[PDB]
Write a protein that binds this DNA or RNA. Structure first.
Ligand SMILES: [Zn+2]
Lengths: 317, 53, 120
RNA sequence: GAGCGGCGGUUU
RNA sequence: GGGCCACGGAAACCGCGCGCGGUGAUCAAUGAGCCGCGUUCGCUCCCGUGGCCCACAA
């Protein structure tokens, strides 16, 4: 049940004395509802029927948004986890598109096969598979239940793996053939089936409860802080005196770091966080965790995407 | 639709009673929604009562 | 039991429900399925609305009880959507049914609107 | 303009 | 010069799918079939225009 996103990370401390000034910035739950939307992500449970693109156009018209973008496009008949990044948080999907996914799938065999052979043949698909020509990882498959020709199973895969096509190859390897009759995405990156997973009915009702009834509590729980879209990434946390500089397009130099995750290698996509855990920017490491820790000078992260507004923190340079 | 789930356990199953926990299961897929939402007004009348607003 | 199920209904009262639907079908005029049922209420044509208690997802019929009340149309719950479907003259199930024109069920229906009346 | 996680075809 | 932010890098028809309205079915009423109307998100590069900064964190 393990995806590469699940790896636990260790926090290496670089500047023990760093503290944050509670007067600057807006940590997630200090955000007024309007600001929460501007930097919000919805963990939407997509219904079977409409395309991913239509669903988002609905959300935009009904919530009066200018902009919104989903991650991994689910097919029309497929339900489940569809991250919807809103307004100024739109560009964080680029952090999810590449993340692992998980599905519960219903496979219909075209001929009779013993239960044991199904389970045994399916376990052989863990590891690499081919399709399109391209290669792609299956991290795990588990067979929940078999009912004659109906096989219900969970599968964890890398971004861009077609389950439909996986199921077809399972059908060929059994001889009798098979098609996918039902599909549901249960996870995408840090988005999972928890209490944040919200249907469209709930989404739109909470919205109205807020707009028309003055109750803010449900709509506010319906939207997640954009920081959520970044839980799976390695992070470096920076001092207050580097934050406005970073938001102004400065590269992040070693002397700006308070804390970082262990195991960062050159080239890695990193999230840059304030000590309040607000998201500042996405960048690409120019140093390993050990270098950033030992050194006192140099560029540590190449700042590529900046999300935090330039006025949350003072120009401390 | 055939895929179901335990509201207690989160087990996915084809059965009506969870095999881990024994609770009645529910259809995994979300209800269909339409941008017209003709009965929204009445669904919200019901949902407030449930929630307590 | 489901949250759209707004009150407890006796076994023989829910049996009469199927009866009125049984009769009305062939002596009178009904509508089967939540979409026709909902049309009939909005159009003010339904004399009685019957809702099944095992509807999953709840959203399928949950707008029904509050819609009736707006149109002051009586509604009752029956145990099963399979049984309610068979009564309506189809093999498949029915989340809900509207009895448009009663017939041999005139008294039965009139009776039911009275019993349920007290449960509100 | 070239890609990622295609809605498909024809006209300037 | 360099980084970062914004805008831009097509338009009208047809079709599938889906949705809504209407009709409502010899195991799809949690909606067949048919008729009419609606309907498809963004991201990454790179190039152009414009805005903000040039900040090793003090
Ligand atoms: Zn369990």
């Amino acid at each position: 049940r393990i995806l590469p996103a699940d790896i636990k990370r260790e926090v290496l401390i670089k500047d023990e004395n760093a503290e944050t000034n509670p007067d600057w910035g807006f940590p997630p739950e200090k955000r007024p509802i309007e600001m929460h939307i501007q930097f919000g992500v919805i963990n939407l449970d997509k219904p079977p029927g409409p395309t991913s693109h239509e669903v988002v156009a609905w959300i935009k018209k009904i919530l009066n948004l200018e902009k919104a973008g989903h991650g991994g496009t689910l097919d029309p008949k497929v339900s489940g986890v569809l991250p919807v990044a809103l307004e100024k948080a739109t560009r964080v999907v680029q952090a999810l598109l590449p993340a692992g996914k998980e599905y519960v799938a219903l496979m219909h065999l075209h001929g009779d096969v013993p239960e044991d052979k199904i389970i045994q043949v399916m376990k052989e698909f863990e590891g690499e598979i081919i399709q399109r020509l391209r290669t792609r990882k299956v991290y795990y498959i588990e067979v929940l239940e078999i009912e004659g020709r109906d096989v219900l199973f969970r599968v964890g895969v890398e971004a861009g793996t077609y389950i439909r096509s996986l199921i077809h190859h399972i059908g060929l390897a059994l001889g009798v053939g098979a098609h996918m009759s039902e599909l549901r995405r249960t996870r995408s990156g840090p988005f999972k089936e928890d209490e944040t997973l919200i249907t469209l009915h709930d989404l739109v009702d909470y919205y109205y409860f807020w707009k028309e009834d003055g109750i803010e509590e449900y709509f506010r729980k319906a939207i997640q802080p954009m920081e959520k879209a970044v839980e799976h990434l390695p992070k470096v946390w920076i001092k207050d005196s580097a934050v406005a500089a970073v938001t102004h397009g400065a590269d992040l130099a070693v002397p700006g770091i308070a804390k970082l995750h262990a195991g960062i290698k050159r080239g890695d996509l990193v999230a840059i966080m304030t000590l309040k855990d607000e998201l500042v920017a996405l960048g690409k490491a120019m140093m390993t965790s050990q270098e950033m820790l030992e050194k006192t000078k140099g560029i540590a992260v190449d700042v590529e995407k900046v999300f935090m507004p330039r006025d949350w923190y003072p120009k401390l340079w | 639709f055939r895929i179901r789930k335990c509201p207690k356990c989160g087990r996915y199953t084809l059965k009506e009673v969870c095999p881990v926990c024994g609770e009645k299961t529910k259809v995994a897929h979300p209800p269909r929604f339409s941008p017209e939402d003709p009965y929204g007004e009445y669904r919200r009348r019901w949902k407030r009562e449930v929630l307590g607003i | 039991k489901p949250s759209y199920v707004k009150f407890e209904v006796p076994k023989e009262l829910a049996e009469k429900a199927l009866q009125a639907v049984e009769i009305a079908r062939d002596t009178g005029k009904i509508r089967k399925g939540t979409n026709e049922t909902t049309k009939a209420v909005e159009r003010g044509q339904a004399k009685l609305v019957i809702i099944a208690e095992d509807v999953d997802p709840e959203e399928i019929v949950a707008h029904l009880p509050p819609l009736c009340e707006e149109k002051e149309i009586p509604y009752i719950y029956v145990p099963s959507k399979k049984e309610l479907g068979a009564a309506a003259g189809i093999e498949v199930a029915a989340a809900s049914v509207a009895i448009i024109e009663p017939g041999k069920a005139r008294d039965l229906v009139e009776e039911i609107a009275m019993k349920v009346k007290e449960l509100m």
